[PDB]
Design an enzyme around this catalytic site. Structure first.
Site, PDB file in Angstrom:
ATOM      1  CB  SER A  67      -0.976  -0.033   1.201  1.00  0.00           C
ATOM      2  OG  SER A  67      -1.323  -1.373   1.617  1.00  0.00           O
ATOM      3  NE  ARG A 164      -6.416  -4.662  -5.679  1.00  0.00           N
ATOM      4  CZ  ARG A 164      -5.874  -5.708  -6.321  1.00  0.00           C
ATOM      5  NH1 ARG A 164      -5.943  -5.828  -7.652  1.00  0.00           N
ATOM      6  NH2 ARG A 164      -5.263  -6.657  -5.622  1.00  0.00           N
TER       7      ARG A 164
END
Length: 393
Positions: A67, A164
C-alpha cells in the site's frame, strides 16, 4: 554518531537479536543533499536458507512496497497533469467512462436485495488522489460487506471487469474521506492517457530519471532480483513471536534505497520527476473544512487501523495528494513540523517528507501486520533521534 542516534541504533540491534523483529532498513535525508544516513539491520527473512544462516536485508533488497505504492502512482498522475494529458478537475469519464458509469450503493431493502442509485455529483482526478471519490475498499465498509455477502461482485467476470475495479461506490464524490480503491483507477487513467501499461510508464518516467533498477511491478520477470527478494514475516497474536509467511495503488516491489531516491527528489525541489509548483500541491491540504473534520473524527475513532502510524493517535490532520498532512506541529521543534506529508504501506513501511524541517525519512520493514508495536516504537524513536542530532547538533 549522536547521543540519541547511537542509543537508537543499538536499540534496533537489540530488537533484531532478541527475535523481536527480523530486521529493518532505515534512512534519513535532507534538502541540502548533504545529510546521508542509511543503516541496515538484521535479516530479510525469518526462514533459513539452504545453509542454516538467514540472508540479511540491505538497501538493494527487493521488498513489497504494498500500500506504499500509492505515492508512485500519485506521482505518475501529476506527471500526466503537467504534460497536458489530463486535468485535476476534469471529469474522469473522458478517460474512465466505465468508472463514471458505476453506480453508488445506497443501502439494502428488507428482502435484502441490493438498493442502488446513480451518482449525485461528478468525479475528478483530484477526488481520486485525495480518496474523496466517494468509493471505498470492500472489507472496510459495512454496505460493501453485505454486497459482498450477497455475491453481487461475482458478475464482473461476465463483462471482463477487473476484480478490484468491480465494487460500487458507497457515497457521492466530495462527500467523505474514504480509504479506497481510487488509486487503481488512477493507475488506469494513466495507462489510457499515455497508451502505456504502467510497468513501461514506471521505468520511463520514474526509474530512468533517478537511475533506478530495482523498481518493478512484474517481479516474476526478474530472476536476478526475484531470487534475492525479502520474504514476508508475520507476527502471532498469542506469542508476540514471528513466523514465516498490475494495478497502480499497490503491488510494486522495490529496493528501499531506491524508494528513498524518490522521496529525496521531491523533498529538494530537484525537478527530476515532477515540477516544484505541482509538488507544492501535493503538500496543499486538499480537504474542505467539513471534510477534514470528519476525516480526523474517523481516524481518531479507528485506532485499530491507525492510518497515522507512528505519529500521535489523536492529531489534527488533513490530506493532500499522496498522503496525510500534519496540520499542527507534532511535538514542538523536536519532531515533525506542521506541513509534513506522511503515509505508509502494509508491512510497517512508513515514509514522511517534512519541508519546513528540511528532512525526509523512511523506515522500512517487511513484517505484517500493519501497526506493529515494536515497529512503531522503533520508528518513533528513529525519527526522534535523527531529528534531534541533525537539527540541533
Amino acid at each position: 554518531a549522536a547521543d540519541p542516534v547511537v542509543l537508537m541504533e543499538t536499540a534496533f540491534r537489540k530488537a533484531v537479536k532478541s527475535r523481536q523483529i527480523p530486521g529493518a532498513v532505515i534512512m534519513a535525508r535532507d534538502a541540502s543533499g548533504n545529510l546521508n544516513y542509511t543503516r541496515c539491520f538484521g535479516a530479510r527473512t525469518v526462514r533459513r536458507d539452504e545453509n542454516n544462516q538467514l540472508p540479511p536485508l540491505q538497501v538493494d533488497t527487493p521488498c513489497r512496497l504494498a500500500s506504499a505504492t500509492k505515492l508512485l502512482t500519485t506521482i505518475m498522475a501529476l506527471q500526466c497533469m503537467e504534460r497536458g494529458l489530463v486535468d485535476l478537475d476534469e471529469t474522469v469519464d473522458r478517460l474512465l467512462p466505465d468508472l463514471s458509469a458505476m453506480p453508488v450503493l445506497e443501502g439494502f431493502d428488507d428482502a435484502g436485495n441490493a438498493r442502488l442509485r446513480e451518482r449525485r455529483g461528478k468525479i475528478t482526478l483530484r477526488h481520486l488522489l485525495t480518496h474523496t471519490s466517494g468509493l471505498s475498499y470492500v472489507f472496510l465498509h459495512p454496505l460493501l460487506r453485505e454486497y459482498m455477502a450477497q455475491g453481487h461482485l461475482q458478475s464482473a467476470e461476465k463483462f471482463g471487469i477487473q476484480s478490484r475495479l468491480a465494487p460500487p461506490a458507497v457515497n457521492d464524490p466530495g462527500a467523505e474521506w474514504i480509504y479506497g480503491a481510487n488509486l487503481d483507477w488512477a493507475g488506469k487513467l494513466v495507462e489510457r492517457a499515455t497508451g502505456l501499461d504502467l510497468e513501461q510508464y514506471l521505468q520511463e518516467n520514474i526509474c530512468a530519471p533517478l537511475g533506478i533498477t530495482d523498481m518493478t511491478f512484474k517481479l516474476q520477470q526478474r530472476p536476478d532480483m526475484l531470487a534475492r527478494r525479502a520474504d514476508q514475516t508475520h507476527r502471532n497474536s498469542a506469542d508476540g513471536r514471528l513466523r514465516y509467511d498490475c494495478f497502480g495503488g499497490q503491488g510494486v516491489f522495490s529496493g528501499p534505497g531506491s524508494y528513498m531516491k524518490v522521496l529525496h527528489s521531491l523533498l529538494k525541489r530537484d525537478g527530476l520527476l515532477l515540477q516544484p509548483q505541482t509538488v507544492d500541491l501535493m503538500f496543499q491540504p486538499a480537504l474542505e473544512p467539513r471534510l477534514e473534520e470528519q476525516m480526523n473524527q474517523h481516524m481518531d475513532a479507528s485506532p485499530h487501523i491507525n492510518y497515522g502510524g507512528p505519529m500521535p493517535m489523536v492529531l489534527r490532520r488533513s490530506f493532500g495528494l499522496g498522503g496525510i498532512i500534519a496540520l499542527e506541529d507534532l511535538d514542538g521543534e523536536n519532531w515533525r513540523r506542521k506541513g509534513s506529508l506522511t503515509f505508509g504501506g502494509g508491512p510497517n513501511i512508513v515514509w514522511q517528507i517534512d519541508p519546513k524541517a528540511g528532512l525526509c525519512t523512511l523506515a522500512f520493514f517487511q513484517l505484517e501486520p500493519w501497526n506493529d508495536p515494536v515497529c512503531r516504537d522503533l520508528t518513533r524513536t528513529f525519527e526522534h533521534a535523527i531529528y534531534a542530532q541533525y537539527q540541533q547538533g
